[PDB]
Amino acid sequence: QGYDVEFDPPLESKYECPICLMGLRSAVQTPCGHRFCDSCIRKSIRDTGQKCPVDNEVLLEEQLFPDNFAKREILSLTVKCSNFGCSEKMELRQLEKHLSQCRFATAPCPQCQESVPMSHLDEHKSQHCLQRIMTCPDCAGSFVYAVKQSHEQFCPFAN
Amino acid sequence: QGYDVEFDPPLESKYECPICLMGLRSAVQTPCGHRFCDSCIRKSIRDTGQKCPVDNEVLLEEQLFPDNFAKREILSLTVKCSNFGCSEKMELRQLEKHLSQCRF
Amino acid sequence: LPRRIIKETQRLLAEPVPGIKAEPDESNARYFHVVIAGPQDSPFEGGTFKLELFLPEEYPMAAPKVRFMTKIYHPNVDKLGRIKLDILTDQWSPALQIRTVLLSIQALLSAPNPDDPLANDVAEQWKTNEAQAIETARAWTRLYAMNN
Amino acid sequence: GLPRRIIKETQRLLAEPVPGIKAEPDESNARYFHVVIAGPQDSPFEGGTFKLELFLPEEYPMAAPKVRFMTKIYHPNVDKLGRIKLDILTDQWSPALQIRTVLLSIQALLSAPNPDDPLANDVAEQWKTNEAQAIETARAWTRLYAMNN
Amino acid sequence: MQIFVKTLTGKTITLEVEPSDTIENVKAKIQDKEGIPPDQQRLIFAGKQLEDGRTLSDYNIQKESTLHLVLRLRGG
Amino acid sequence: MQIFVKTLTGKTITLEVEPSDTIENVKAKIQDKEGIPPDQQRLIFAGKQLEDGRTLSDYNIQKESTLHLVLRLRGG
Ligand SMILES: [K+]
Ligand SMILES: [Zn+2]
Ligand SMILES: [Zn+2]
Ligand SMILES: [Zn+2]
Ligand SMILES: [Zn+2]
Ligand SMILES: [Zn+2]
Ligand SMILES: [Zn+2]
Ligand SMILES: [Zn+2]
């Protein structure tokens, strides 16, 4: 359940969740002095029993607290985009914001729900994506490139 | 009241107490999300009031918890002796052990 | 001469702020001779105001003691140089340092407040007659806070 | 969905091998592991190479891996079916534990047999009452079945 | 541009921003690195109390400039 | 001196010792670094469980040798 993302430099084990083995998503510390993802440790309390997994001390839903100091230092760690050609780095914090406008990202089409690279979705109006809306040359009517064949009924433009 | 000592490399800001400005003795963290010595923050709630010193946010005796994770990390930092011509280096943990058997 | 004070001293001696000067007395290590400059776009342009700052036995658990030893026409500063400032007036934090105090004093000169006054007479004129109160502030700057 | 935990663990087992423990995933199933552990030093089993088979259930790591010996081994805590009487695998499993720590414990178990908490009752009984004979048969079983494979 | 900020404790944080960033944003980017909510921040620069709506270019802040953080002006 | 120890999660730490140290005080240096109390630690090396009474030189441990730490709750 933790932060699954390529860190560079790679994640120091102090921010590594000993259950899921990732960057600590909503990090929580135990009284015995343990760092876990809230979600992970709370399942470990559910299915494995009421104990800290690492030292066999006693543990419960209540007495764990959020390590807010550790969580912020976590989101400041530099990470790489997870789309193909990205070649770019940023703080983990703004991975989400960057994936919106990744240069090399893949975005399904508004019109054709065929997935398309962000660079080329700009070029995916002029060159017809198969449901893109052509404007008749020499009669001036709006129709969807899918339905051309039937518009060839209606270029008998009176006066 | 925090760990007054020559750290080497020198103490980084994350283990420094905003109140005393020294290594976090028996560190405690707020739910607000910052750190203080147990003694120091508890004195800040005695006198300066029920607030976090660094944010003006709510803070009570109850919701302070010990950042035990931080405390080790701190005791694992290497430090120098404080008697005159010593120059021995060690993990902070055994500073008191060494100053019992120290030279000057 | 407790550690918090010593570190804080040599911290602000090495990192001095634009137009804030603060040095301990040779005699007492808790008494600081302070001068803060009149800020940019302020009524007090070109002014150099002395201050007596002192650290009490309590410090840092209590706020420092601060007075203006130069006369200044200002609705939050009385004729004795006593100061109405949130930090050291009432709710204080032991996180705060001399550095932050002195900055907040500077920030007070940048934003005079008639609605949270100490000098009741000044703030009255400051609210109803801003223009004149500012001109008097400038006049007091020029008479008292130059070449001292 | 081949959960990161398992993957991360897998490529560490190959890259940072524990001395005398080999563990590789099956070419078909990523959760199934062909293991070989060495008969440890000064033991009954020294010189031995023992095949085991370890499998990760879908619960993992919230439930323990299921592992058995495929090689025949005279040991009070391993039955004829190759099931192992070792706490880690029974109750009070912990999701902090990893495959490495399982296999290391099995290696340890070969150095330190336990007749008092038996599984092969015939063997443990032998081990308590006549230890030298049991240990000598142990080296022979090692010799017959855990060399040249 | 990279600009310096001194928190209450005295240690120095450096932040990446451009001149068309509002103070609002600077306080939000301070919050992310120090946990102090935007309400509870007051930034001083060159003895001037910086306001939320306006931008870095409105106070002509340049590269390598040091902002200073203090607590909210809650006069009493 | 300066021995290696692989904790439960995979972390590799280093501990300064001398050969005539007991396993007991080694397990103490683990607790100081990693929070696990000595009662819950089990130390493995070349497939042997290291016992609390004996020393490191009694098991022929040396420079840069990697101990492995695992958990207890045994005999089940
Ligand atoms: K930390
Ligand atoms: Zn986790
Ligand atoms: Zn624990
Ligand atoms: Zn990208
Ligand atoms: Zn399309
Ligand atoms: Zn047409
Ligand atoms: Zn302190
Ligand atoms: Zn010494």
What amino acid occupies position A149?
A: Q
A73 contact residues in E (CB cutoff 8 A): none
DSSP D67: E
Report chain breaks in chain F, C–N > 2.5 Å, as residues after which they occur.
none
Distances (CA, A) of C9 to B16, B22, C48, E9: 17, 14, 22, 13
Q: Which residues contact A42 (CB under 8 A, 6 or more apart)?
A: A61
State phi, psi for B75 to the nearest 5 degrees: -70, -15
User: What letter does residue A45 receive in the DSSP assignment?
Assistant: I
- List chain B residues with CB under 8 Å of F33: 72, 76
Reduced to 3 states, what is the DSSP secondary structure of residue A48? Answer: helix
CATH code of residue B23: 3.30.40.10
Q: How far apart are CA C91 and CA D93, in angstroms?
A: 52
Q: How far apart are CA F60 and CA A135, in angstroms?
A: 86
Q: Half-sphere exposure of F47 toward its Cβ, with a 13 Å CA cutoff? A: 22
Using only the alpha carbons of chain B, give its radius of gyration. Answer: 15
What number of other Cβ atoms are within 10 A of residue A42's Cβ? 14
DSSP character for C39? P
- Total structural domains within chain D: 1
Q: CA–CA separation, C133 vs C122, rounded Å? A: 7
Q: Report the alpha-carbon distance of residue B34 to residue B56 in Å, rounded.
A: 12
Q: How far apart are CA C74 and CA A125, in angstroms?
A: 65
Distances (CA, A) of D90 to D60, D83, D102, D103: 14, 11, 12, 14
| Contact call for A72 and B14, based on CB within 8 A | no
Structure tokens at B38: 């147990």
Residues of E with Cβ-Cβ distance to C42 under 8 angstroms: 47
Q: Is the peptide bond before D17 cis (omega within 30 degrees of 0)?
A: no
Peptide bond into E38 cis (omega under 30): no
Ligand nearest to the CA of A19: 2
d(CA A145, CA A129): 8
Q: Which of A17, A24, A55 to mutate to test the interface with F (most CBs of F within 10 A)?
A: A55
Of the residues A14, A62, A65, A76, the best mutation for testing chain B's interface (the one with the most B CB atoms within 10 Å of its CB) is A65
Distances (CA, A) of B21 to B12, E39, E76, F48: 11, 25, 28, 47
- Give phi and psi for D96, each to the nearest 5: -70, -35
| Domain containing residue B31 | 1-104
> Maximum distance among all alpha carbons in chain C?
49
* Cβ-Cβ contacts under 8 Å, E70 against chain C: 87, 96, 100, 103-104, 107
Using an 8 Å CB-CB cutoff, list chain A residues near B33.
66, 68-69, 71-72
User: Chain E residue closest to A77 (CA)?
Assistant: E33
Q: Give the CA radius of gyration of chain A.
A: 26
CB atoms under 10 Å from CB of D30, counted, come to 14
- Compute the distance between CA of residue A11 and CA of residue C98 in angstroms, rounded to an integer: 39
How far from each other are the two terminal CA atoms of chain B, in whole angstroms?
A: 24
Q: Which residues from chain A sit within 8 angstroms of residue F72, using beta carbons?
A: 56
Cβ separation of B48 and C92 shorter than 8 Å?
Answer: yes
Residue A28 phi, psi (nearest 5): -130, 140
**Residue among B56, B8, B53, B63 nearest B30 (CA):** B63
What is the rounded distance in angstroms from the CA atom of residue A47 to the CA atom of residue F65? 36
Q: For chain E, what is the domain count? A: 1
C-beta atoms of B29 and A73 within 8 A? no
Q: Residue B93 and residue F35: Cβ atoms within 8 Å?
A: no
Residue C73 in tokens: 């026409």
| Shared-domain flag, residues A112 and A101 | no
Nearest ligand to residue A152 Cα: 6
Residue F47 has its nearest CB partner, among D41, D85, D101, at: D41
Task: Looking at the complex, report in whole angstroms how far the Cα of residue D137 sits from the nearest Cα belonging to chain A.
Answer: 38
Angstrom distance (rounded) from CA B24 to CA E9:
14
Q: Any CB–CB contact under 8 A between E71 and chain B?
A: yes
Residues A139, A97 share a domain: no
Question: Distance (Å, rounded) from C-alpha B32 to C-alpha D94?
Answer: 31
Q: Å from B97 to nearest chain E CA?
A: 31
DSSP assignment of B19-30 equals TT-SB-TTEEE-
Total structural domains within chain A: 2
Q: How far apart are CA D64 and CA C25, in angstroms?
A: 69
Contact F47, F75 (CB under 8 A): no
**What is the distance in angstroms between the CA of the first residue and the CA of the last residue of chain C?**
31
Beta-carbon separation of B20 and C3 below 8 A: yes
Closest CA to D55 of D102, D21, D16, D95: D102
Among candidates E20, E68, E63, which has minimal Cα distance to E41? Answer: E68
Q: How far apart are CA D7 and CA D21, in angstroms?
A: 18
Comparing CA positions, the residue from A68, A67, A71, A100 lying closest to residue A83 is A100
Q: Give the whole-angstrom CA distance, residue D77 versus residue D72.
A: 12
Bridge partners for A7 per DSSP: A79
* DSSP conformation class of B87: -
Q: What is the DSSP string of F6-72?
A: E-TTS-EEEE---TT-BHHHHHHHHHHHH---GGGEEEEETTEEPPSSSBSGGGT--TT-EEEEEE-
Taking the centre of ligand 3 as the mean of its atom positions, its distance from the CA of residue F18, in whole angstroms, is: 28
CATH classification at residue C98: 3.10.110.10
Distance CA C17, CA C14 (A): 10
For residue A122, what are its two tokens?
């700009």
Could you tell me how many CB contacts below 8 A there are between chain A and chain D?
35
Contact A56 F73 (CB under 8 A): yes
Residues in chain D: 149
- Count CB pairs under 8 A between chains A and F: 24
Question: C17 and C34 in contact (C-beta within 8 Å)?
Answer: no
Instruction: Look at C106 and E73 and tell me if their CB atoms are within 8 Å.
Output: no
Instruction: Check whether residue A20 and residue A62 sit in a common domain.
Output: yes
Structural resolution in Å: 3.9
Tell me how close the Cα of B90 comes to any Cα of chain C, in angstroms.
Answer: 22
The phi and psi torsions of A51 (rounded to 5 degrees) equal -150, 155
Amino acid in the structure at residue B61: E
Mutation for A interface: F13, F36, F69, most A CBs within 10 A: F36
Structure method: X-ray
Residue D116 identity (one-letter amino acid): D
The full DSSP string for A117-147 is: EHHHHSTTTTTTPTT-EEE-TTT--EEEGGG
The 10 Å Cβ neighbour count of residue D29 is 10
* Residue B79 to residue B87: CA distance in whole angstroms: 10
- Reference E33, options E61, E56, E12; nearest CA is E12
Chain F residues near residue D18 by CB distance under 8 angstroms: 68
Residue of chain F whose alpha carbon sits nearest to that of D21: F47
CB neighbours (10 Å) of residue D26? 12
Any residues with CB less than 8 A from the CB of A126 and at least 6 apart, and which?
Answer: none
Residue ranges making up the domain that contains E52: 1-76
